[PDB]
Paper text:
[name] lacks a transmembrane region, and its N-terminal PAS domain ([name]) binds a wide range of effectors, including toluene, to trigger increased basal autophosphorylation of [name], leading to a phospho-signal relay to [name] and ultimately transcriptional stimulation of the tod operon genes by interacting with phosphorylated [name] in the PtodX promoter region (11–14). In the present study, we determined the crystal structures of the [name] [name] domain in complex with either toluene (an agonist) or 1,2,4-trimethylbenzene (1,2,4-TMB; an antagonist), as well that of apo-[name]. The structure of each [name] domain is very similar to those described for other PAS domain structures, which consist of a five-stranded antiparallel β-sheet and three α-helices spanning residues 45–149.
Toluene is a key signal effector required to activate the [name]/[name] signal transduction system. We determined the structure of [name] in complex with the agonist toluene. The overall structure of the complex is generally identical to that of apo-[name]. The agonist is positioned in a hydrophobic pocket formed by the hydrophobic residues Phe46, Gly48, Val59, Ala63, Phe79, Trp84, Trp85, Ile114, Val126, Phe128, Ala145, and Gly147 in each [name] molecule. In detail, the benzene ring of toluene is placed into the area formed mainly by the aromatic amino acids Phe46, Phe79, Trp84, Trp85, and Phe128. The methyl group of toluene is surrounded by the residues Gly48, Val59, Ala63, and Ala145. The [name] protein was titrated with toluene, and the ITC data were integrated and fitted into a “one set of binding sites” model, which yielded a stoichiometry of 1:1 and a binding affinity (Kd, dissociation constant) of 8.5 μm for each molecule in the [name] dimer. In the [name] structure with toluene, the corresponding region is dramatically reconstructed into an α-helix. By contrast, in molecule B, tilting of the Phe46 aromatic ring occurred only in response to the agonist toluene, and this was linked to the formation of a salt bridge between Arg148 and Glu146 and the transformation of the flexible STR region (in apo-[name]) to an α4 helix. Upon toluene sensing at an effective level, the [name] STRs are reconstructed to induce functional reorganization of [name] and transmit signals to [name]/[name], ultimately up-regulating the tod operon.
Numbering used by the authors:
A (entry chain B): 43 to 167
B (entry chain A): 42 to 165
Protein backbone atom coordinates (compact mmCIF):
# COMPACT_ATOMS: atom_id res chain seq x y z
CA UNK A 1 0.00 0.00 0.00
CA UNK A 2 1.48 3.36 -0.92
CA UNK A 3 2.68 6.09 1.48
CA UNK A 4 2.86 8.85 -1.14
CA UNK A 5 0.55 9.04 -4.12
CA UNK A 6 0.10 11.64 -6.95
CA UNK A 7 -1.87 12.00 -10.17
CA UNK A 8 -0.01 13.47 -13.21
CA UNK A 9 -1.17 14.25 -16.71
CA UNK A 10 0.39 12.36 -19.60
CA UNK A 11 3.22 14.95 -19.85
CA UNK A 12 3.96 14.76 -16.09
CA UNK A 13 2.23 17.95 -14.94
CA UNK A 14 1.02 17.63 -11.38
CA UNK A 15 -2.77 17.30 -10.89
CA UNK A 16 -3.18 15.87 -7.35
CA UNK A 17 -0.86 14.77 -4.52
CA UNK A 18 -1.79 13.32 -1.15
CA UNK A 19 -1.21 15.29 2.03
CA UNK A 20 1.35 12.81 3.43
CA UNK A 21 3.64 13.54 0.42
CA UNK A 22 3.13 17.36 0.61
CA UNK A 23 3.81 17.45 4.39
CA UNK A 24 6.86 15.18 4.00
CA UNK A 25 8.41 17.55 1.47
CA UNK A 26 7.29 20.80 3.06
CA UNK A 27 5.65 21.52 -0.34
CA UNK A 28 2.23 23.17 -1.16
CA UNK A 29 -0.09 22.33 -4.08
CA UNK A 30 0.09 25.90 -5.07
CA UNK A 31 3.85 25.54 -5.73
CA UNK A 32 3.66 22.42 -7.86
CA UNK A 33 0.15 22.19 -9.48
CA UNK A 34 0.31 22.25 -13.27
CA UNK A 35 4.08 22.16 -13.44
CA UNK A 36 6.26 19.14 -14.26
CA UNK A 37 6.55 16.59 -11.48
CA UNK A 38 10.35 16.47 -11.83
CA UNK A 39 10.58 20.16 -10.97
CA UNK A 40 8.97 19.62 -7.52
CA UNK A 41 11.30 19.80 -4.55
CA UNK A 42 11.18 16.09 -3.66
CA UNK A 43 13.32 15.49 -6.79
CA UNK A 44 15.80 18.30 -6.36
CA UNK A 45 18.79 16.61 -4.61
CA UNK A 46 20.80 17.18 -7.82
CA UNK A 47 20.55 17.73 -11.59
CA UNK A 48 20.94 13.93 -11.80
CA UNK A 49 18.01 13.07 -9.51
CA UNK A 50 15.79 15.61 -11.39
CA UNK A 51 16.89 14.12 -14.74
CA UNK A 52 16.10 10.58 -13.50
CA UNK A 53 12.56 11.66 -12.54
CA UNK A 54 12.09 13.39 -15.89
CA UNK A 55 13.14 10.12 -17.65
CA UNK A 56 10.86 7.99 -15.37
CA UNK A 57 7.88 10.28 -16.32
CA UNK A 58 8.73 10.28 -20.09
CA UNK A 59 9.18 6.52 -20.26
CA UNK A 60 5.94 5.92 -18.25
CA UNK A 61 4.09 8.25 -20.62
CA UNK A 62 5.32 5.99 -23.48
CA UNK A 63 3.61 3.04 -21.68
CA UNK A 64 6.42 1.54 -19.57
CA UNK A 65 5.67 0.36 -16.02
CA UNK A 66 8.61 1.89 -14.25
CA UNK A 67 9.89 1.41 -10.72
CA UNK A 68 13.08 2.17 -8.85
CA UNK A 69 14.54 3.07 -5.57
CA UNK A 70 15.13 6.84 -5.24
CA UNK A 71 16.22 9.31 -2.56
CA UNK A 72 13.93 12.23 -2.10
CA UNK A 73 13.61 15.38 -0.01
CA UNK A 74 10.63 13.85 1.66
CA UNK A 75 11.02 13.86 5.48
CA UNK A 76 10.86 16.62 8.15
CA UNK A 77 9.15 19.14 5.88
CA UNK A 78 11.74 18.66 3.19
CA UNK A 79 14.79 19.01 5.41
CA UNK A 80 15.78 15.39 5.30
CA UNK A 81 16.34 12.65 2.70
CA UNK A 82 14.45 9.42 2.67
CA UNK A 83 14.70 6.45 0.39
CA UNK A 84 11.54 5.48 -1.44
CA UNK A 85 10.38 2.63 -3.67
CA UNK A 86 8.94 4.70 -6.45
CA UNK A 87 6.65 3.71 -9.34
CA UNK A 88 4.63 5.22 -12.16
CA UNK A 89 1.59 3.47 -13.59
CA UNK A 90 0.36 4.68 -17.00
CA UNK A 91 -3.42 5.22 -16.97
CA UNK A 92 -5.09 4.69 -20.39
CA UNK A 93 -8.46 5.84 -21.56
CA UNK A 94 -11.04 3.70 -23.39
CA UNK A 95 -9.06 4.10 -26.67
CA UNK A 96 -5.77 2.92 -25.17
CA UNK A 97 -4.19 6.47 -25.00
CA UNK A 98 -2.26 7.31 -21.89
CA UNK A 99 -4.07 10.24 -20.27
CA UNK A 100 -2.68 10.17 -16.67
CA UNK A 101 0.18 8.68 -14.70
CA UNK A 102 -0.18 7.42 -11.14
CA UNK A 103 2.89 8.12 -9.02
CA UNK A 104 3.37 6.00 -5.93
CA UNK A 105 5.98 5.94 -3.16
CA UNK A 106 6.54 3.21 -0.61
CA UNK A 107 9.05 2.98 2.27
CA UNK A 108 12.28 1.05 1.89
CA UNK A 109 13.72 -1.23 4.60
CA UNK A 110 17.01 0.21 6.05
CA UNK A 111 20.08 -1.77 4.92
CA UNK A 112 21.14 -2.35 8.54
CA UNK A 113 17.65 -3.56 9.41
CA UNK A 114 17.73 -6.16 6.66
CA UNK A 115 21.20 -7.30 7.78
CA UNK A 116 19.88 -7.57 11.38
CA UNK A 117 16.90 -9.62 10.16
CA UNK A 118 19.12 -12.19 8.47
CA UNK A 119 21.61 -12.31 11.39
CA UNK A 120 18.74 -12.93 13.78
CA UNK A 121 17.21 -15.74 11.58
CA UNK A 122 20.59 -17.51 11.17
CA UNK A 123 21.11 -17.21 14.91
CA UNK A 124 17.56 -18.51 15.84
CA UNK A 125 17.66 -21.69 13.69
CA UNK B 1 -11.98 17.32 -21.10
CA UNK B 2 -10.14 17.52 -17.72
CA UNK B 3 -12.19 16.43 -14.72
CA UNK B 4 -13.65 18.61 -12.05
CA UNK B 5 -14.16 15.80 -9.45
CA UNK B 6 -11.65 12.95 -9.21
CA UNK B 7 -11.24 9.92 -6.98
CA UNK B 8 -8.89 7.01 -6.71
CA UNK B 9 -10.48 3.66 -5.76
CA UNK B 10 -9.00 0.34 -5.09
CA UNK B 11 -9.68 -2.75 -7.32
CA UNK B 12 -12.93 -3.39 -5.33
CA UNK B 13 -14.17 0.21 -5.46
CA UNK B 14 -13.17 1.25 -1.87
CA UNK B 15 -12.22 4.91 -1.65
CA UNK B 16 -8.49 5.78 -1.38
CA UNK B 17 -8.24 9.55 -2.37
CA UNK B 18 -10.74 12.24 -3.51
CA UNK B 19 -10.03 15.83 -4.47
CA UNK B 20 -11.16 18.71 -2.32
CA UNK B 21 -13.64 20.06 -4.93
CA UNK B 22 -15.65 16.77 -4.74
CA UNK B 23 -15.47 16.55 -0.93
CA UNK B 24 -16.62 20.15 -0.41
CA UNK B 25 -19.38 19.85 -3.03
CA UNK B 26 -20.74 16.64 -1.46
CA UNK B 27 -20.23 17.84 2.19
CA UNK B 28 -18.11 14.73 2.82
CA UNK B 29 -14.98 14.17 4.88
CA UNK B 30 -12.14 11.88 3.77
CA UNK B 31 -12.57 9.94 7.07
CA UNK B 32 -16.27 9.20 6.42
CA UNK B 33 -15.41 7.44 3.12
CA UNK B 34 -11.83 6.20 3.11
CA UNK B 35 -11.55 2.45 2.76
CA UNK B 36 -15.33 2.07 2.21
CA UNK B 37 -17.15 1.41 -1.06
CA UNK B 38 -17.48 4.42 -3.34
CA UNK B 39 -21.26 3.78 -3.84
CA UNK B 40 -21.85 4.25 -0.13
CA UNK B 41 -20.57 7.82 -0.26
CA UNK B 42 -23.13 10.64 -0.10
CA UNK B 43 -22.82 11.71 -3.74
CA UNK B 44 -24.61 8.51 -4.75
CA UNK B 45 -27.32 8.53 -2.06
CA UNK B 46 -30.22 10.39 -3.84
CA UNK B 47 -32.06 6.95 -3.53
CA UNK B 48 -31.58 3.23 -3.23
CA UNK B 49 -31.74 3.19 -7.05
CA UNK B 50 -28.91 5.65 -7.50
CA UNK B 51 -26.77 3.76 -5.04
CA UNK B 52 -27.52 0.49 -6.86
CA UNK B 53 -26.54 2.12 -10.17
CA UNK B 54 -23.20 3.31 -8.80
CA UNK B 55 -22.53 -0.15 -7.27
CA UNK B 56 -23.07 -1.78 -10.69
CA UNK B 57 -20.86 0.81 -12.46
CA UNK B 58 -18.05 0.18 -9.94
CA UNK B 59 -18.39 -3.53 -10.37
CA UNK B 60 -18.26 -3.11 -14.20
CA UNK B 61 -15.03 -1.08 -14.00
CA UNK B 62 -13.61 -3.68 -11.54
CA UNK B 63 -13.80 -6.18 -14.41
CA UNK B 64 -11.78 -3.93 -16.80
CA UNK B 65 -14.70 -2.34 -18.69
CA UNK B 66 -14.55 1.43 -19.05
CA UNK B 67 -17.70 3.38 -17.93
CA UNK B 68 -19.04 6.70 -19.03
CA UNK B 69 -22.47 8.03 -18.47
CA UNK B 70 -24.55 10.96 -17.31
CA UNK B 71 -25.69 10.77 -13.70
CA UNK B 72 -27.00 13.04 -10.94
CA UNK B 73 -25.23 13.47 -7.67
CA UNK B 74 -25.60 15.26 -4.29
CA UNK B 75 -22.67 17.39 -5.22
CA UNK B 76 -23.23 21.02 -4.60
CA UNK B 77 -23.76 23.16 -1.44
CA UNK B 78 -22.34 20.63 0.95
CA UNK B 79 -24.58 17.82 -0.30
CA UNK B 80 -27.80 19.87 -0.30
CA UNK B 81 -28.09 20.27 -4.08
CA UNK B 82 -28.18 17.87 -7.02
CA UNK B 83 -26.01 18.45 -10.06
CA UNK B 84 -25.83 16.58 -13.32
CA UNK B 85 -22.39 15.03 -13.95
CA UNK B 86 -20.63 13.49 -16.95
CA UNK B 87 -19.16 10.52 -15.01
CA UNK B 88 -16.48 8.05 -15.95
CA UNK B 89 -14.57 5.18 -14.40
CA UNK B 90 -11.18 4.13 -15.78
CA UNK B 91 -9.87 0.71 -14.80
CA UNK B 92 -6.16 0.87 -14.07
CA UNK B 93 -4.14 -2.34 -14.67
CA UNK B 94 -0.66 -3.33 -13.69
CA UNK B 95 1.81 -4.79 -16.30
CA UNK B 96 0.42 -8.30 -15.64
CA UNK B 97 -2.98 -6.93 -16.68
CA UNK B 98 -4.75 -7.20 -13.28
CA UNK B 99 -6.94 -4.30 -12.21
CA UNK B 100 -5.26 -2.57 -9.28
CA UNK B 101 -7.15 0.75 -9.08
CA UNK B 102 -10.09 2.64 -10.55
CA UNK B 103 -10.06 6.33 -11.43
CA UNK B 104 -13.45 8.05 -10.98
CA UNK B 105 -13.87 11.36 -12.79
CA UNK B 106 -16.72 13.81 -13.25
CA UNK B 107 -17.55 17.18 -14.76
CA UNK B 108 -20.66 19.17 -13.78
CA UNK B 109 -22.97 19.45 -16.81
CA UNK B 110 -25.86 21.20 -15.10
CA UNK B 111 -25.32 24.46 -16.95
CA UNK B 112 -24.75 22.59 -20.33
CA UNK B 113 -28.19 20.91 -19.96
CA UNK B 114 -29.84 24.23 -19.07
CA UNK B 115 -28.21 25.88 -22.15
CA UNK B 116 -29.43 23.01 -24.36
CA UNK B 117 -33.00 23.50 -22.91
CA UNK B 118 -32.78 27.21 -23.77
CA UNK B 119 -31.56 26.47 -27.31
CA UNK B 120 -34.50 24.09 -27.83
CA UNK B 121 -36.94 26.88 -26.84
CA UNK B 122 -35.11 29.45 -29.04
CA UNK B 123 -35.22 27.17 -32.05
CA UNK B 124 -39.02 27.33 -31.68
Amino acid sequence: LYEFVGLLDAHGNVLEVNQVALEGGGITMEEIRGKPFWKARWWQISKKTEATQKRLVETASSGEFVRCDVEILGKSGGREVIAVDFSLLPICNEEGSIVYLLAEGRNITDKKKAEAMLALKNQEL
